[PDB]
A paper describes a structure:
To investigate the cause of the lack of activity of Lassa EN we structurally characterized the Mn2+ ion bound form by X-ray crystallography to see how it differs from the active ENs. Using a construct encompassing residues 1–174 from Lassa L protein we obtained three different crystal forms: one with no ions bound (crystal form X1), and two with one or two Mn2+ ions bound in the active site (crystal forms X2 and X3 respectively). Compared with the X1 form, the X2 and X3 forms show a 17 degree rotation between the helical bundle lobe (residues 4–49 and 149–167) and residues 50–148, with the hinge being at the base of helix αb. The closure of the two lobes slightly changes the orientation of the active site residue E51.
This involves cleavage of host mRNAs close to their capped 5′ end by an endonuclease (EN) domain located in the N-terminal region of the viral polymerase. The sNSV cap-snatching ENs belong to the PD-D/ExK superfamily of cation dependent nucleases.
Author numbering: 0 to 170
């Protein structure tokens, strides 16, 4: 019933998720869930991951899979920093003293898109000023999207997945 619908949406994902090794852990995280809330959560994380991996691949950035702060990233490259505002980017790339940072987001309604853009922009611009004092040049990239569509699953499957996972909340 609920077991039947849960089995069905997993079946949907097994058929259609691209055969990409970088998705394997999170795909399995999704497939092992038996409760609707847990299933929803792991399904949204899978779609988020697909988007982040695409955005990083497009922009040549390392994907920030461990949610490292900027301070942590720089410290891992031997770079010490003053107190920075806390920022966890989706992707990064350090080349000498030039740091590229990438955020990506989804907002399907334009008013929200514009508000969130300003939100991410402000976080990133705070860093830029502060890194300048340690002669790190920040290159802030914002990849704002209007849907959850991505290269790892068909768009129609994407829609059906999200729809189903939220609905299951029926149980």
């Amino acid at each position: 019933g609920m077991e039947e619908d849960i089995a069905c949406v997993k079946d949907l994902v097994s058929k259609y998720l691209a055969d990409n090794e970088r998705l394997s852990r999170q795909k399995l995280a999704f497939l092992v869930q038996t409760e609707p809330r847990m299933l929803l959560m792991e399904g949204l994380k899978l779609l988020s991951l697909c988007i982040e991996i695409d955005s990083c691949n497009a922009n040549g950035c390392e994907h920030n899979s461990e949610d490292k702060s900027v301070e942590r990233i720089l410290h891992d490259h031997g770079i010490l920093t003053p107190s920075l505002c806390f920022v966890v980017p989706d992707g990064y790339k350090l080349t000498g003293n030039v740091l590229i940072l990438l955020e990506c987001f989804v907002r399907s309604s334009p008013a929200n898109f514009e508000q969130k853009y300003i939100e991410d922009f402000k976080k990133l611009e705070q860093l830029k000023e502060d890194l300048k004092t340690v002669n790190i040049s920040l290159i802030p990239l914002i990849d704002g999207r209007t849907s959850f569509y991505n290269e790892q699953i068909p768009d129609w499957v994407n829609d059906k997945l999200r729809d189903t996972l939220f609905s299951l909340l029926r149980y």
